[PDB]
């Protein structure tokens, strides 16, 4: 009966957890948790999330 625009993000559970951490810090990122591997995210924040994930993973001093 209702539709809303957004960006669907499909990712592994560990990445889902990381995006939730990003949201908790920055807010206004995650619109809905959909399932263990899917989120609805603010479309204007998708590139931010992708860049931040890359930084979190690639720049980790314990790599």
């Amino acid at each position: 009966a209702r539709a809303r625009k957004g960006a669907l993000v499909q990712c592994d559970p560990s990445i889902k957890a990381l995006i939730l951490q990003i949201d908790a810090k920055m807010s206004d990122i995650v619109l809905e948790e959909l399932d263990d591997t899917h989120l609805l995210v603010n479309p204007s924040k998708v590139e931010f999330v992708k860049h931040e994930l890359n930084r979190l993973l690639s720049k980790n001093i314990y790599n």
Partner: protein, 62 residues
Amino acid sequence: ELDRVITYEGSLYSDFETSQEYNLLSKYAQDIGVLLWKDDKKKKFFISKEGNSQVLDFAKRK
């Protein structure tokens, strides 16, 4: 894996009154190849931005 994170623009459908209405639109969306995700237990699904107008049109014709 980060290499496996995929994102898609589109529309999340929800608030279905009946299981039959939800599954009708879900099936039509799958038939025309525009359904990206669904969860029967929540009666929600996500349609590609490209496919959204056709799904809306089908809904409004029932």
